[PDB]
Amino acid sequence: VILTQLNEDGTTSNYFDKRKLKIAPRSTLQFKVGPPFELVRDYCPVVESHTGRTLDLRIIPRIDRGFDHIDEEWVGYKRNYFTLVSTFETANCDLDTFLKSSFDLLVGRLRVQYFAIKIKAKNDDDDTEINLVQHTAKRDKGPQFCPSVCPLVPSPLPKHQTIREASNVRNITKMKKYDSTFYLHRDHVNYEEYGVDSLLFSYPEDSIQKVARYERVQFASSISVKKPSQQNKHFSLHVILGAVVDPDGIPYDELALKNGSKGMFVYLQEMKTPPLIIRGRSPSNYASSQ
DNA sequence: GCGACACTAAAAC
DNA sequence: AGTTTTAGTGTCGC
């Protein structure tokens, strides 16, 4: 009824079928590691502005809620939240050095203002994009919003347990405990150590995330989860690492920039999940029907 | 089969 | 030790 896998940090992922077993909403059994991500491709090379050295990049993503491994399928529920977290790493550059340096895209060099992640959902069979929505903890008593582009600096990905523990923190003392894991406060560095041109000082805000945390995410309520044949549709979640550049022949999305102008989120790397099944609102998807 | 509202159980404090 | 918060899902009404 419950199938258990040991996670990397010694927590468990407990996979169960909600058609057969109902578990409380806030049970720790709702937290579990989702499908592993795979490389789609690498896109634009990035080089350090004097040495010319190519920056090695790797997305480090994980799903921490919302998906169960059931009968060799990865299964989510339309009505329920998923969590997708990601960092990136630069294998050949330590953070402290990285932040003082400057980087160009090799396309013909465009200067990188900052690095960022975005997520997308797709129909895995035809590449059609599927809208995602997020809520705040207040859910219907707060706003709905689409996942945003998240400026980030390189960081190790927190353990599954850490994401769990930080999921609903409001208490100031506990927030302080996790602050260094999730944020870099640029306003607290010694500005004299940095050149005007440094990467750190072209990030758009002083509070810079170390981890992209997309919590309380759902597929848009309009999604059709079955094909006309009544076979399940296959979806996939995508994580894209980009460099944001000033717009003034390679894959990119336009971005609403800080100064107001029409920025450019130039793709660097993309990963995706294997195929995902999503169960809809049908009563037959819930143990209550049995 | 959707948005809204309701109920409820364990986490958070 | 009690009260509030959060989120899976049951239900209503178009």
Side-chain angles (χ1 to χ4, degrees), chain A residues 19 43 50 95 106 132 146 155 158 175 212 218 235 246:
Chain A
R19 281 163 167 185
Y43 293 94
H50 282 88
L95 178 68
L106 282 195
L132 292 176
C146 69
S155 173
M175 289 284 285
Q218 290 172 263
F235 298 97
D246 199 321

Side-chain angles (χ1 to χ4, degrees), chain A residues 35-169 171-257 259-261 263-280:
Chain A
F37 288 75
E38 58 189 58
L39 181 66
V40 175
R41 62 191 67 92
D42 288 292
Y43 293 94
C44 196
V46 182
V47 295
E48 205 289 324
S49 294
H50 282 88
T51 64
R53 187 204 311 174
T54 65
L55 187 67
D56 294 331
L57 300 163
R58 185 169 65 96
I59 295 164
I60 312 177
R62 194 176 63 236
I63 287 162
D64 282 320
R65 189 184 190 88
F67 287 89
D68 291 86
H69 203 189
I70 287 158
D71 319 308
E72 312 294 306
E73 304 191 300
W74 281 101
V75 178
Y77 268 66
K78 192 169 172 176
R79 298 196 71 199
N80 299 346
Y81 290 164
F82 72 87
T83 290
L84 192 166
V85 298
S86 193
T87 59
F88 79 108
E89 64 145 47
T90 52
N92 58 341
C93 203
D94 67 279
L95 178 68
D96 299 325
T97 298
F98 173 89
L99 294 172
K100 288 172 178 188
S101 295
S102 62
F103 299 92
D104 291 330
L105 299 186
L106 282 195
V107 335
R109 283 148 169 266
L110 320 182
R111 175 61 48 82
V112 175
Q113 290 185 0
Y114 58 97
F115 297 88
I117 274 179
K118 67 162 59 180
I119 64 166
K120 293 180 172 186
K122 298 198 187 209
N123 181 325
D124 197 57
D125 292 326
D126 77 347
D127 202 47
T128 289
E129 184 165 354
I130 304 295
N131 293 316
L132 292 176
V133 305
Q134 280 180 275
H135 285 77
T136 72
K138 301 304 191 212
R139 197 164 62 185
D140 290 359
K141 311 205 116 74
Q144 290 180 25
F145 55 100
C146 69
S148 57
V149 171
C150 186
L152 246 24
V153 293
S155 173
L157 186 64
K159 303 167 175 205
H160 176 54
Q161 204 175 322
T162 296
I163 298 309
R164 277 202 202 174
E165 293 165 353
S167 54
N168 282 295
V169 183
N171 177 266
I172 291 283
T173 292
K174 199 188 265 182
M175 289 284 285
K176 281 165 155 177
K177 165 161 137 184
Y178 290 107
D179 180 74
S180 70
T181 295
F182 294 114
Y183 300 99
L184 174 58
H185 300 286
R186 181 176 63 195
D187 53 310
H188 300 164
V189 308
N190 185 352
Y191 285 12
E192 303 197 0
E193 293 183 24
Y194 293 84
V196 162
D197 235 13
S198 64
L199 175 67
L200 179 54
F201 285 86
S202 48
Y203 273 69
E205 306 294 339
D206 292 338
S207 181
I208 304 164
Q209 286 181 232
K210 295 176 175 171
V211 184
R213 276 191 299 165
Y214 298 95
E215 300 178 280
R216 313 187 181 80
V217 199
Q218 290 172 263
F219 290 77
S221 60
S222 68
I223 65 149
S224 180
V225 304
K226 288 190 177 281
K227 304 189 185 182
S229 63
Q230 317 185 55
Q231 294 170 20
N232 291 313
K233 281 204 201 180
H234 298 306
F235 298 97
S236 172
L237 291 162
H238 290 239
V239 181
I240 305 160
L241 176 67
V244 174
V245 303
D246 199 321
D248 69 357
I250 61 181
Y252 78 93
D253 299 327
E254 285 197 68
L255 181 58
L257 222 53
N259 69 344
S261 61
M264 198 152 66
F265 176 93
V266 176
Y267 286 27
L268 306 178
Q269 189 179 98
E270 178 173 7
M271 296 185 82
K272 73 172 186 176
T273 64
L276 312 171
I277 296 318
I278 305 298
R279 284 171 186 181

